[PDB]
Amino acid sequence: LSTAILKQKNRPNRLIVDEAINEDNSVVSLSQPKMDELQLFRGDTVLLKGKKRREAVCIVLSDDTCSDEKIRMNRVVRNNLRVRLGDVISIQPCPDVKYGKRIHVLPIDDTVEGITGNLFEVYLKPYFLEAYRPIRKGDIFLVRGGMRAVEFKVVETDPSPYCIVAPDTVIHCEGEPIKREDEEESLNEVGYDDIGGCRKQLAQIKEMVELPLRHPALFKAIGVKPPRGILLYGPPGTGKTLIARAVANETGAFFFLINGPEIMSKLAGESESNLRKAFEEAEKNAPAIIFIDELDAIAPKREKTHGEVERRIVSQLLTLMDGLKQRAHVIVMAATNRPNSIDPALRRFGRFDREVDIGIPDATGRLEILQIHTKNMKLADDVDLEQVANETHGHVGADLAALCSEAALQAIRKKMDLIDLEDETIDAEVMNSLAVTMDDFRWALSQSNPSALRETVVEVPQVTWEDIGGLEDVKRELQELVQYPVEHPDKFLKFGMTPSKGVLFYGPPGCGKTLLAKAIANECQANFISIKGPELLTMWFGESEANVREIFDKARQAAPCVLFFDELDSIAKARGGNIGDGGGAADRVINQILTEMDGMSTKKNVFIIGATNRPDIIDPAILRPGRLDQLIYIPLPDEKSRVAILKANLRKSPVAKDVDLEFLAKMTNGFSGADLTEICQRACKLAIRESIESEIRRERERQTNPSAMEVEEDDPVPEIRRDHFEEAMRFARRSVSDNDIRKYEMFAQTLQQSRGFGSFRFPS
Amino acid sequence: GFSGADLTEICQRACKLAIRESIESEIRRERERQTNPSAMEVEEDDPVPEIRRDHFEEAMRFARRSVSDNDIRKYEMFAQTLQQSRGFGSFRFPS
């Protein structure tokens, strides 16, 4: 009674698609109580619901021979409802039993060719002769009243929803031959489910948009104000105009597209007229959506604006923007690659206040995009899309389409040997028997250049607590700072504590200090932004203090993050390590991290994790309360963490079943966490090499005796095969010597040994 | 010899030992009562409502003196030098 018009009219009596063998285009096989629930009498026509208001109706007959769970239909109505078999369809009567005054069905000649005559007497007679055939205004029904499939395109129907077109009222023969090529122009209206990798942000766009659009009365009544404009932004080609078309085509709202260059390419003084005639025409129509695409072209930073007419379109845009108020019920959205590349006068309140962020798709978004872009190809059975989605690590929503196109072209190319050089009469199997293999996808992947290799990736990591193993104390002391302030925030209000906002790991170099950040980020399902040393040290060699702000503001729009500043000591040891000229702590970059860290309220759930190998040169201005507070010393793996590390590195490589990792982890004693990832690779080359060697030597010896005929040898080495490790152990070094351990173990007892009041006891 | 900002980690680290306990004594109770899901007598009003001394007994085990006694000398040997450069004392106007 407060939250219930929010449904899309889902019904208990939904009938699911069931195949039929009939040729009548308006016969329905319904459940037996279908005439009974709503007391559906005979003599009317029901209103079946598909999508995008692109539907197709039937004449509802007392033919209830089907079952109680599904509906049996032909291709005609279910497909002309613009829904495939697998879309929900509502059943509901429509009292619009009307007779067509002047209709307009558009034939296609190839289906019509043969007998032509006059359209009326030759085709409208044997089709409309009281044949139980009502339509919906604007469809293309399929005619099985001949030997072959024939479609006529409905355009005009005097009743607005639809009617039972009858010959009793005159029917014009003004239909005209159309072509199959014209379907995509109407299918420019894109359904909702044709977007992948955006299930996280599309929810935000929905909650912002449909509630203001499909329920104006609630907003006008309660008085809460819908947004005056969204501002999507992301790397180019992630399919944003498609998002706008989806959002405005599945909510029933007129859509108007303003291109960027198309405005900035007309005569000086004519573009502004186009902007006015766009914002004017939109407000006249229904609740609309203006999508000002490529906004950083008609409104760059001022530092690009140099002409006067270049700065008059911006003013016209601002005037039209703030001219919007609640009367018009119009909503605007934009698109730019990076938020700060827009004129700052636009973000002021009332114009583009709120700002969604489409990002690079993540490991499952790529799978969804691939499954969308390969729903037409004839993939071979050996295809594995969950595989190819895994290694494409820079691609965006447009690169994957090109990749699939390239694989299809490669299949065509391998078919060209048997294709005649002048094969205009391309044979049926040459058009249909095509099958793309993993050979093709790996080839095309190797021949693709990713478009987005240089953007910080914000996605939940997959490494879990079972890889590191051990480290029991760190597990708890890292839960209680990243998970508790997220899963139980009210406990932090029952008492008065403010959550911590920092940790500082320090340990021997290369000892799984990164895997702990990813593990804890994987626990609480939090994003994970990694900043590497070779990146901060770039900032120290030029501009600073203009990108750290942007890093933090990126982490803010994706809470809860676990921002991981790797090698906080990079600048400090790249400046002298107690530099000779004098410079003590400040380095123009860490200072900026401080300035941003303090100016960030704890309510936002952003936790900053550092990691250093030289935990004394680190600036003493960060180890102060209110900033990175404590220090956790990550020791070398002891006995169980080594077993887990070995079993984590040896997962993708088929290992022998008689290998004793419990022994190999018991002899390797002071080994780091990064010299057990070497033993588990140098023990692969010793099996790779012995594989190519024996392959080549067999191909040799067989050619020595070609008449030997001896064939069908399966494989000489499928397996890492112990007595490989027994050799890879001969090149196994130790990263950190003992003196490099009693250097940190003698720093812990410097942070320690200034404590120890545990003798404290409350008297009585 | 405790600073004004080392008594604010005997007063927080004495609360992360209550947040811990009241967030364990909750979760532990969930798994407990699945032994008797039909008991219908569950949900004690408060397992730990209170900072509850014997926490400061423990939080005092991670109390670190920030300013060592060898660094508080550099100041007391300054302010004492602003004095001893003063004191005209027996100054007294005639009659």
Side-chain angles (χ1 to χ4, degrees), chain A residues 204 482 485-486 489 498-501 526-527 552-563 596-597 599-608:
Chain A
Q204 300 188 13
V482 180
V486 163
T498 180
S500 302
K501 64 170 65 176
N527 306 347
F552 273 89
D553 262 350
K554 182 188 300 179
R556 192 187 304 235
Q557 303 166 3
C561 278
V562 288
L563 274 157
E596 258 286 357
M597 185 180 288
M600 183 188 49
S601 180
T602 67
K603 211 73 56 170
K604 280 301 301 192
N605 299 323
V606 170
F607 308 97
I608 303 178

Side-chain angles (χ1 to χ4, degrees), chain B residues 55-69:
Chain B
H55 283 97
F56 300 98
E57 288 279 334
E58 173 69 277
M60 270 298 297
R61 189 158 291 112
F62 317 125
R64 196 174 79 270
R65 214 202 184 220
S66 288
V67 295
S68 58
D69 200 4

Side-chain angles (χ1 to χ4, degrees), chain A residues 66 147 208 241 246 279 350 404 461 481 502-503 559 590 727 732 734 754 763:
Chain A
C66 181
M147 273 307 316
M208 301 192 148
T241 182
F279 279 88
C404 295
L481 321 173
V503 179
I590 287 177
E727 175 67 278
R734 221 185 158 197
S754 302

Side-chain angles (χ1 to χ4, degrees), chain A residues 674-687:
Chain A
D675 280 307
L676 291 158
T677 305
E678 173 277 356
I679 296 178
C680 285
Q681 285 187 357
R682 168 168 305 274
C684 286
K685 290 191 289 186
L686 297 196

Side-chain angles (χ1 to χ4, degrees), chain A residues 565-580:
Chain A
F565 286 107
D566 195 320
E567 285 294 331
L568 271 173
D569 79 18
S570 176
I571 302 102
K573 78 167 75 173
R575 213 175 71 265
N578 305 330
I579 184 173

